[PDB]
């Protein structure tokens, strides 16, 4: 893919599913505030979103999706988020005739259970990246990320067990916001491909 010089880089067209990341993304300069009300589409209930809906709203250069937070009383089965995300992600892919930079990311806040993790990685053609929030040598929070954004795998922590996540998934939700700090900075490698706002 040709890498443009900065002067007519374009603004990222974003489609954000379930969670909204508009303001996490303006925090990094990808969307200019007060800017057009179209740069970012957000939908929470995609139950009746069809292919032509996504074609109309788009095109998009980034498709983001995330499960609810850990302590959140989820009403839908955790896999619904992954299947619905995959479904719409296909609607927004570029046609093979018109190739263009296209990025996607799905984030799990320890909502998908173990059996859901393999189907996730099978559908998204990739093993997840574990980005923990560690404080004082103890595991406080973590997300799992599937994405084709260039650097995602280098934010992994192999030090974090699968049982360490499961027990944190047991204990912390029993007691009980979205840990977007863990995910915000993965988008930085996209800065080259689209306009930066100051």
């Amino acid at each position: 893919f040709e890498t443009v010089p900065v002067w007519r880089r374009q603004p990222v067209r974003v489609l954000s599913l379930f969670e909204d990341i508009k303001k996490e993304l303006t925090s990094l300069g990808f969307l200019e505030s007060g800017s057009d009300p179209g740069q970012l589409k957000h939908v929470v209930d995609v139950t009746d979103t069809v292919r032509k809906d996504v074609e109309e709203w788009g095109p998009f250069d980034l498709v983001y999706g995330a499960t609810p937070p850990l302590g959140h009383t989820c009403d839908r089965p955790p896999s619904w988020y992954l299947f619905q995300f995959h479904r719409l992600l296909q609607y927004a892919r570029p046609k093979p005739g018109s190739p263009r930079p296209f990025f996607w990311m799905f984030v799990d806040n320890l909502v998908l259970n173990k059996e859901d993790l393999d189907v996730a990685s099978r559908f998204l053609e990739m093993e997840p990246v574990t980005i923990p929030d560690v404080h004082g040598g103890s595991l406080q929070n973590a997300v799992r990320v599937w994405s084709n954004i260039p650097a995602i795998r280098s934010r992994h922590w192999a030090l974090v067990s699968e049982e360490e996540l499961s027990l944190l998934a047991q204990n912390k939700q029993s007691s009980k916001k979205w840990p977007t700090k863990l995910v915000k900075n993965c988008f930085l490698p996209l800065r080259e491909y689209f306009k930066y706002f100051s």
Partner: protein
């Protein structure tokens, strides 16, 4: 314009090879029939009743994007995922997203791998089947992922059983009206063995449907086979007892229904 060639099939959750039996009895030449199935008794019925013309590949969750390129191309992709987690007959059913219900998304996943890419106008046919008795939100969600609405075909019109199923797909003429054939056994008594009398005219899914010598009795395997339109002794394979055979036939497609749906495929592929 392209000359007729034998059909290349991918059957997920293939069971006892109904899709191959209907295609062969329709006279369609079968170049390749990759069946994905895990039940060993199931695999045995298909292996011997079709003499190893089926390529078994086991669990549908281990079929990879590159498996679908290597084995393919496929002209026809068919599937009928397990149902007892989507049926309102089951009180303990976990729905479309848990249990065996989420096996639908595997069929959806593999379909897209199987589908031709942009620039490829070659014919591509597919059909997915499941139970009418689902939660309406599951029916909706399946229709949304497959991007089409189902047809409702009940085997009662062509067999002697109550078997209402939804069929999603793009097969030619799925909506055309279902017309019974002379050879179809429409009433139960058409499926019974000698000296056995049918209590009712159609069987549903009475636990003693037949009376023999003035006394009740259950159905026989050979009789079940006729109710589902399968050849007699189709499941007399590998020393299977009563309980095994009737499980395979209970999960089955009613073959006259499939004959109805696959019948137009004769006009698109090489035939004997």
């Amino acid at each position: 314009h392209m000359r007729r060639r034998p059909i290349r099939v991918l059957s997920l959750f293939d069971g006892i090879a109904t899709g191959y039996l209907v295609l062969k009895e329709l006279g369609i030449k079968v170049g390749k029939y990759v069946a994905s199935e895990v039940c060993e008794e199931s695999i045995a019925v298909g292996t011997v009743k079709h003499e190893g013309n089926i390529k078994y590949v086991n669990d549908v969750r281990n079929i990879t994007k590159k498996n679908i390129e290597e084995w393919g191309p496929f002209d026809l992709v068919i599937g009928g995922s397990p149902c007892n987690d989507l049926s309102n007959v089951n009180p303990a059913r976990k729905g479309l997203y848990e249990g065996t219900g989420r096996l639908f998304f595997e069929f959806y996943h593999l379909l897209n791998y199987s589908r031709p890419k942009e620039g490829d106008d070659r014919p591509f046919f597919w059909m997915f089947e499941n139970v009418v008795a689902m939660k309406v939100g599951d029916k909706r969600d399946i229709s949304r992922f497959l991007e089409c609405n189902p047809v409702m075909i009940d085997a009662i019109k062509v067999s002697a059983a109550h078997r209402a199923r939804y069929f999603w797909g793009n097969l030619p003429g799925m909506n055309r009206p279902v017309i019974a054939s002379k050879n179809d056994k429409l009433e139960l008594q058409d499926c019974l063995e000698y000296n056995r009398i049918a209590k009712l005219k159609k069987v549903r899914t009475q636990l003693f449907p037949v009376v023999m010598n003035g006394k009740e009795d259950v159905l026989w395997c050979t009789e079940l086979e006729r109710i589902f339109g399968f050849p007699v002794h189709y499941t007399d394979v590998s020393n299977m007892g009563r309980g095994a055979r009737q499980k395979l036939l209970g999960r089955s497609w009613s073959v006259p229904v499939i004959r109805h749906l696959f019948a137009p495929l004769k006009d698109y592929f090489a035939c004997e």
